[PDB]
Coordinates of C-alpha atoms in Angstrom, one line a residue:
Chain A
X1 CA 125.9 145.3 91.4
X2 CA 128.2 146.8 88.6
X3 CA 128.6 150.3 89.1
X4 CA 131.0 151.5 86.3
X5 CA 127.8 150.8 84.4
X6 CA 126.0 154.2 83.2
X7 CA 122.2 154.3 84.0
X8 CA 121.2 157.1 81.2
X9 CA 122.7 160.3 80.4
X10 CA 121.4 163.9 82.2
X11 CA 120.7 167.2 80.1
X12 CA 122.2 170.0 82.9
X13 CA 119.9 171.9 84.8
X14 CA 122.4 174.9 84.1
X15 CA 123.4 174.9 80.3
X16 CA 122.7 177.6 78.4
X17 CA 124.5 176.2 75.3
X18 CA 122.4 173.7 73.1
X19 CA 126.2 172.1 72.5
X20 CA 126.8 168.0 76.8
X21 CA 124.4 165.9 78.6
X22 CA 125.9 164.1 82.0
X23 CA 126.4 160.4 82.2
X24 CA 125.0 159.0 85.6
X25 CA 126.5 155.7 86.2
X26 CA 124.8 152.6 89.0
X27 CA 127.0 154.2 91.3
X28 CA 125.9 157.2 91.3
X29 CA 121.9 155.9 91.3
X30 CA 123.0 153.7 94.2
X31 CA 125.3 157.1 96.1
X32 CA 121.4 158.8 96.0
X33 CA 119.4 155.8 97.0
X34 CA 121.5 155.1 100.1
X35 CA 122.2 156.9 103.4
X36 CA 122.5 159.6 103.9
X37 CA 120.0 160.6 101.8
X38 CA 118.1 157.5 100.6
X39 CA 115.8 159.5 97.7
X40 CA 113.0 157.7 96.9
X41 CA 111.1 157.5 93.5
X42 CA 109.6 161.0 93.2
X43 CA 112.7 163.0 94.4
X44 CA 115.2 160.4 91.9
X45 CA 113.1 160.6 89.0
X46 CA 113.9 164.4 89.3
X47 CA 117.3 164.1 89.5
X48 CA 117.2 162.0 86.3
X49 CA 115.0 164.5 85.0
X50 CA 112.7 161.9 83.9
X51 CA 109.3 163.0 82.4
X52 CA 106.8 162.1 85.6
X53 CA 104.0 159.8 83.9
X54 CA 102.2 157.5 86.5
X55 CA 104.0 154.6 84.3
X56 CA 107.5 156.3 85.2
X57 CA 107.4 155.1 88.7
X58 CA 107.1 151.2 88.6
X59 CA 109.2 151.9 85.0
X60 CA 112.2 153.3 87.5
X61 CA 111.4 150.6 90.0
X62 CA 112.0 148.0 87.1
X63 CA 114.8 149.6 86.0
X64 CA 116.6 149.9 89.6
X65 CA 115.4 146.0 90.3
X66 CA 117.0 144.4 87.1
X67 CA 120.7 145.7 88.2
X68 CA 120.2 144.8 91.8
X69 CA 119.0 148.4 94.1
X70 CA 115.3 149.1 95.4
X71 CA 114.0 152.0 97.7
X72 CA 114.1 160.9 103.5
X73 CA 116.7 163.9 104.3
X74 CA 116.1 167.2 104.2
X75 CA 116.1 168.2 99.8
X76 CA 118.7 171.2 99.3
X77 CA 118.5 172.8 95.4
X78 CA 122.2 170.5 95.5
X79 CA 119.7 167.7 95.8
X80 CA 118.5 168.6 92.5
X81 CA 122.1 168.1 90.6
X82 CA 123.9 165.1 89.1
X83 CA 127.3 164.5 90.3
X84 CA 129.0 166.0 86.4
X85 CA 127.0 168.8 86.9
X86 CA 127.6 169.3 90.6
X87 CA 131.7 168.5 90.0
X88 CA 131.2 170.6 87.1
X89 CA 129.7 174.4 89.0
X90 CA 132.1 173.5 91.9
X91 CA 134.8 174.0 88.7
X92 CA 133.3 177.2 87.5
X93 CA 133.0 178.6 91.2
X94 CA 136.6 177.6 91.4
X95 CA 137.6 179.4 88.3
X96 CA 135.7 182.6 89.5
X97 CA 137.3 182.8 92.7
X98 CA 141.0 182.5 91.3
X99 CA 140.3 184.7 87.6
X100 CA 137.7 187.4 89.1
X101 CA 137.6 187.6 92.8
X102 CA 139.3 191.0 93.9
X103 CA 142.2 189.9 96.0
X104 CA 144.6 193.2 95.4
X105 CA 141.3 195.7 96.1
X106 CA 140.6 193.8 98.9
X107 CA 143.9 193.6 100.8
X108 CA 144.9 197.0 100.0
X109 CA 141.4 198.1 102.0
X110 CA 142.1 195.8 105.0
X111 CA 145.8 196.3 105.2
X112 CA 144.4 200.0 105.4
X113 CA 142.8 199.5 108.3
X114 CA 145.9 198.1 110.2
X115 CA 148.0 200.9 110.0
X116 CA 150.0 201.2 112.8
X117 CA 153.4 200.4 113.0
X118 CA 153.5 199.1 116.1
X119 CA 150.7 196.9 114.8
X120 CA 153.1 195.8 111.8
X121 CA 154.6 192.3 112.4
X122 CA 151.8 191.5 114.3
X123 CA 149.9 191.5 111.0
X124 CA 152.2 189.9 109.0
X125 CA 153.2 186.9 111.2
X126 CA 149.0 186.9 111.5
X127 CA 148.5 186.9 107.3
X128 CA 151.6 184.0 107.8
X129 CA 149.8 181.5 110.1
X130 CA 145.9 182.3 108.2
X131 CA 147.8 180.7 104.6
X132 CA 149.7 177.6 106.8
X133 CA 146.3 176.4 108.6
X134 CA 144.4 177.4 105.3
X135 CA 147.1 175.2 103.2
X136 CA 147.1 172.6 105.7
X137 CA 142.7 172.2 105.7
X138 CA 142.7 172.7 101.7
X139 CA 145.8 169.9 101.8
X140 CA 142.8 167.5 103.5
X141 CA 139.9 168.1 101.5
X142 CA 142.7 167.0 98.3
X143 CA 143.0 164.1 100.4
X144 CA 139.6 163.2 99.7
X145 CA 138.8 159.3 98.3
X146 CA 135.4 160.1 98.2
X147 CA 133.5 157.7 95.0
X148 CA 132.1 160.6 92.2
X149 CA 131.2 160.5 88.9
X150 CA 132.9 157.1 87.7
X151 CA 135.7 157.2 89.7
X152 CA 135.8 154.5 93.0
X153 CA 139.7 155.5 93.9
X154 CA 141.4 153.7 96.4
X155 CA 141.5 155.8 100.3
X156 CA 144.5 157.4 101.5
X157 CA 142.8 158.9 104.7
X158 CA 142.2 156.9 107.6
X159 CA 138.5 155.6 107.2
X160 CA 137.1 157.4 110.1
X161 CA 137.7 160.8 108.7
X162 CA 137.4 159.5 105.0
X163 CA 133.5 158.3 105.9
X164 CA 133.2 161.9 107.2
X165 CA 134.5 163.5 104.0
X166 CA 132.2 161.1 102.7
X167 CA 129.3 161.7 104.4
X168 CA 129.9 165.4 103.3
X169 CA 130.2 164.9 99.5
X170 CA 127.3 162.2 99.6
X171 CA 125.0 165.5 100.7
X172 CA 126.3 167.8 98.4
X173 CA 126.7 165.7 95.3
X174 CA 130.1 166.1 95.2
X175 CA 129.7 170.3 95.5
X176 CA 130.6 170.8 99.0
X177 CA 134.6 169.7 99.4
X178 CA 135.8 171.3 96.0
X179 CA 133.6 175.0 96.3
X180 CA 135.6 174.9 100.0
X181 CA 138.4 174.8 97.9
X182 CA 136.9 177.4 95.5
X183 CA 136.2 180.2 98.6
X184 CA 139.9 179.1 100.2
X185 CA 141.5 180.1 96.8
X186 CA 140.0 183.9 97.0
X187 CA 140.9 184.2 100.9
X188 CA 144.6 182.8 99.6
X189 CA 145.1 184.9 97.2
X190 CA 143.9 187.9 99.5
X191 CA 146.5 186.9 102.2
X192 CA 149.0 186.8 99.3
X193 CA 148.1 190.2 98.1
X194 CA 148.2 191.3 101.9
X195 CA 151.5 190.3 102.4
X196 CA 153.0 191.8 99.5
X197 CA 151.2 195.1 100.6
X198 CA 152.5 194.6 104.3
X199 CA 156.3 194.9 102.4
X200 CA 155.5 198.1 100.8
X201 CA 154.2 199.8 104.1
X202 CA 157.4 198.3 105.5
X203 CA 159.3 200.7 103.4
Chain B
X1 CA 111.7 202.4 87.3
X2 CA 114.2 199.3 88.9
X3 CA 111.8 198.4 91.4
X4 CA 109.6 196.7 88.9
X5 CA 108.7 192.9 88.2
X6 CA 109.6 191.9 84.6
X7 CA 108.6 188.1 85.3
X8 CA 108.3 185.3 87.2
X9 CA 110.8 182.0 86.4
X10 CA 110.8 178.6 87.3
X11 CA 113.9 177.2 89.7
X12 CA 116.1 175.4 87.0
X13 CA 117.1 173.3 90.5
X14 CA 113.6 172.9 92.2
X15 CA 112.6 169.1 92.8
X16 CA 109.4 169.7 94.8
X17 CA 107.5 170.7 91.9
X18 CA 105.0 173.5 93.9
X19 CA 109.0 180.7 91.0
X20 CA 111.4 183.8 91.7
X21 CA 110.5 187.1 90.7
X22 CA 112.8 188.6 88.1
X23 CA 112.9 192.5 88.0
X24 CA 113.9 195.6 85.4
X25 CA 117.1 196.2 87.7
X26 CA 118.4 192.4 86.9
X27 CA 117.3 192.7 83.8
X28 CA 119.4 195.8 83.2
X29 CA 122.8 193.9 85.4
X30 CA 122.4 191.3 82.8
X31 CA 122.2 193.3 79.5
X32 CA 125.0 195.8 81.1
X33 CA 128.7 195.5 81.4
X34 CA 130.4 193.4 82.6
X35 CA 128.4 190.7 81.6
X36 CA 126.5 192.0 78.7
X37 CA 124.1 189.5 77.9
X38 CA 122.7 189.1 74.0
X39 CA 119.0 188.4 73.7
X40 CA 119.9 184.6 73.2
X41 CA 121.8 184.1 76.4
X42 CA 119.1 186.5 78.4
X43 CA 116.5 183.9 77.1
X44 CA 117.9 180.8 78.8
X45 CA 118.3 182.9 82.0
X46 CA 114.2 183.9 81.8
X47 CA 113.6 180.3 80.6
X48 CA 111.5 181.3 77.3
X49 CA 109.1 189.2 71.3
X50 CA 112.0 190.2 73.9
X51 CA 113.5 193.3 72.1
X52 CA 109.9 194.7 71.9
X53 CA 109.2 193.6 75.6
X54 CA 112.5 195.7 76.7
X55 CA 112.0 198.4 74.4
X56 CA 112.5 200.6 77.5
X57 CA 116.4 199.0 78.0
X58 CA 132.6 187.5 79.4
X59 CA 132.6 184.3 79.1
X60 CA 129.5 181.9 79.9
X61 CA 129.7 179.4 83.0
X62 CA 126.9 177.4 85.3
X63 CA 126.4 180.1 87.1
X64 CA 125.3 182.6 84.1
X65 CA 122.2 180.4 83.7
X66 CA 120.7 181.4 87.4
X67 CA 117.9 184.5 88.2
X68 CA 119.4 186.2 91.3
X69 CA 117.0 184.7 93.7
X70 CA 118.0 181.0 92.4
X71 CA 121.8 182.4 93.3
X72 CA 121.1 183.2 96.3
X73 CA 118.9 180.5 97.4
X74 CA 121.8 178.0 96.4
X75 CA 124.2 179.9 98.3
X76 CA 122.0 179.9 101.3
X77 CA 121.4 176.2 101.3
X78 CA 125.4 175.7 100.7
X79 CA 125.7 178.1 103.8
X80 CA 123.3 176.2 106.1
X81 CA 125.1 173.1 104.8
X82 CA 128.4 174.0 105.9
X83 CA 127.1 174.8 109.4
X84 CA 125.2 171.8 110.0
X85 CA 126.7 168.8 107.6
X86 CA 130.4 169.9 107.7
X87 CA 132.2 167.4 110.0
X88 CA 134.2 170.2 111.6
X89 CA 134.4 168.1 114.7
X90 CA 136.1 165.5 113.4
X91 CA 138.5 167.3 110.9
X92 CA 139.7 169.3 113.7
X93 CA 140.7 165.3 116.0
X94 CA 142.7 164.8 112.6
X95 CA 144.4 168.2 111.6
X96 CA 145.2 168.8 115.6
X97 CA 147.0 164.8 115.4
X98 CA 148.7 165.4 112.1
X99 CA 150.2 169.1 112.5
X100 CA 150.8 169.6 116.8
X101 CA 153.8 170.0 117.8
X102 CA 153.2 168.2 121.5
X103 CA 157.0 170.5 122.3
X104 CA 154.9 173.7 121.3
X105 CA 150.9 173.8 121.6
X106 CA 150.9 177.1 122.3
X107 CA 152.8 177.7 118.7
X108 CA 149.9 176.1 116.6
X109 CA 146.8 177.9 119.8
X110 CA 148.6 181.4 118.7
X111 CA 147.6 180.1 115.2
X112 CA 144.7 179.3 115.2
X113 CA 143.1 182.3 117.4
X114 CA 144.7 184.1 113.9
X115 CA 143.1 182.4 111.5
X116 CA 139.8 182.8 113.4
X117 CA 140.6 186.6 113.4
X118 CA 141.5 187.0 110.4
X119 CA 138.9 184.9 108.5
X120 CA 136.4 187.2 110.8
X121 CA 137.7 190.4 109.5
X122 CA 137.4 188.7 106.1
X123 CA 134.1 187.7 106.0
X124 CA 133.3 191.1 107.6
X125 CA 134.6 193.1 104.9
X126 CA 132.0 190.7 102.4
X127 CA 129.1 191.3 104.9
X128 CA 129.4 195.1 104.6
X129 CA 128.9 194.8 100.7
X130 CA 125.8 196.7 99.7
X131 CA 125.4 195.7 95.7
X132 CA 122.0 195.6 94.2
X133 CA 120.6 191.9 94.0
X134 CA 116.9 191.3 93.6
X135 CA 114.5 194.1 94.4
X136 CA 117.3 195.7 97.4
X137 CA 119.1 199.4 95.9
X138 CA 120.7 199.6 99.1
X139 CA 123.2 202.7 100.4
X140 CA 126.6 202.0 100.0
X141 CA 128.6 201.6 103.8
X142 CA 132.2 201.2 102.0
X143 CA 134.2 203.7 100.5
X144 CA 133.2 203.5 96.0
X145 CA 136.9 201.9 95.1
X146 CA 136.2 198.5 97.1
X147 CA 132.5 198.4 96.7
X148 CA 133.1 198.4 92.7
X149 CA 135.5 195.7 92.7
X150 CA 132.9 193.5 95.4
X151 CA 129.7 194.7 92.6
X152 CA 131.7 193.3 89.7
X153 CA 132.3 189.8 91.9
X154 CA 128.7 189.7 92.7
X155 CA 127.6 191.3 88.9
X156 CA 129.9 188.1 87.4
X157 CA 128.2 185.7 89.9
X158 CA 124.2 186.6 89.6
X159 CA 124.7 187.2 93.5
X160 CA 126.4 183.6 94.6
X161 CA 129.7 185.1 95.2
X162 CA 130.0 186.9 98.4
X163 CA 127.4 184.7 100.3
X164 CA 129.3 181.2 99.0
X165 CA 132.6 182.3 100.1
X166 CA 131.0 183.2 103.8
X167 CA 129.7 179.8 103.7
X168 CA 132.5 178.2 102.8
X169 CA 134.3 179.9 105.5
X170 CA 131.7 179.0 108.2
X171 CA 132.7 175.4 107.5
X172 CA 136.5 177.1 108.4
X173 CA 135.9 178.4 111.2
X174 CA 133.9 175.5 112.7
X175 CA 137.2 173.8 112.4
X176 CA 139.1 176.4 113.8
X177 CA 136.8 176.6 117.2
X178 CA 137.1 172.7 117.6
X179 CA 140.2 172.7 116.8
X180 CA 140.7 175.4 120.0
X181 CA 138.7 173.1 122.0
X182 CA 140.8 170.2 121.1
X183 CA 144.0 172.2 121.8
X184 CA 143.2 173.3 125.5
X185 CA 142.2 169.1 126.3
X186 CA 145.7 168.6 125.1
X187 CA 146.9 171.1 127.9
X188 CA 145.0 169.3 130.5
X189 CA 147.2 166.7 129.3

């Protein structure tokens, strides 16, 4: 099975711009028809967008059986996405977060609503340890091995956890570990924001 | 009149082939600031004479494609994800190995019980957001300042915001509470 190979190439369920369709390579057809999800047909032909004729089905089947794969979970709206296209929101949600997600309004509210003085460096050194166990979870999912797209890297995690990770991106098509990432980046740069506020009620 | 159905559009990320109701108010987020939508882009979103139809009514990403229900739906799938896929279990064996102290548990216990309050506090603040999405014109809980800079997150998002970063942070605090468990079975050791 040679999985660098691409299969056919995707039009995005979320483009609004006539200007890329995805490549989906073996791998990726092979990533769907396995556990954990193990599509079949039906559900894959959607995926690959493919125009369901009564043909399409032993057409797939053919295709799948010449390059060496044959053929439930619970089907998510992720279920519906190619892995670019997946990668590719979990990159938008991640741009949102850090460009447009309202860090200073929101620190300044709940710094606010700690007040006290007395209750002063117990916020801070509270704001200190949410960023190092934050840091420390986000430093894990970077740590992530996890085959997507093209890419087959070599592991760097222990394979228990790795096949865990793996197990989670499998699900999500490759959504779930980077739009973690995304939401961790607003809640970072509200503990930021908080701190810098906690420094001026200091004074 | 906000309360009224414009149309009905297919889910651009249904598979089972067996439609969310689009209304005037979404309509009218779209075409208004901060997004303002032309009558091209507003066309992908409604998946199809327009000007006529309305006549009377920042940069483009994935997300600016989705009808509110679709961003809503998609963060409520991520959401039940996180809580039931996430391995929160096993991170928390790993990240309680890798970063414990075993000369000071109670150090990285005082930690954690933070993070978990914090985070909670956090992800209060988003649940107490009362912007417009779908057919809801809710009453505002939170003073105008804050609830205009939480509108213009969930305005820029079509409604995914708020609920994705709660779901990302369920999958946190998961984590967190094995983690807690996993710390006190070190103590008994």
């Amino acid at each position: 099975v040679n999985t660098g190979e691409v299969f056919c190439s995707v039009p995005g369920r979320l483009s609004l711009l006539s200007s890329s369709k995805y490549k989906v390579t073996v791998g990726e057809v092979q990533r769907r028809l396995s556990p954990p999800e193990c599509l079949n047909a039906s559900l894959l032909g959607g995926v690959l967008r493919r125009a369901k004729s009564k043909n399409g089905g032993r057409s797939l089947r053919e295709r799948l059986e010449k390059i060496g794969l044959n053929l439930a979970a619970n089907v998510t709206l992720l279920t519906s996405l190619v892995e670019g296209e997946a990668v590719h929101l979990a990159r938008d949600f991640g741009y949102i977060c850090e460009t447009e997600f309202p860090a200073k309004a929101v620190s300044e509210y709940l710094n606010r609503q700690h007040t006290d003085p007395s209750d002063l460096h117990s916020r801070k050194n509270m704001l200190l340890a949410t960023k190092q166990l934050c840091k420390e979870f986000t430093d894990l999912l970077a740590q992530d091995r996890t085959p997507i797209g093209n890419s087959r890297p070599s592991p760097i995690l222990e394979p228990g956890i790795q096949s865990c990770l793996t197990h989670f991106s499998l699900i999500t098509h490759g959504f779930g570990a980077p739009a973690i990432c995304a939401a961790l980046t607003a809640l970072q740069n509200y503990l930021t924001e908080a701190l810098k506020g906690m420094d001026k009620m200091f004074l």
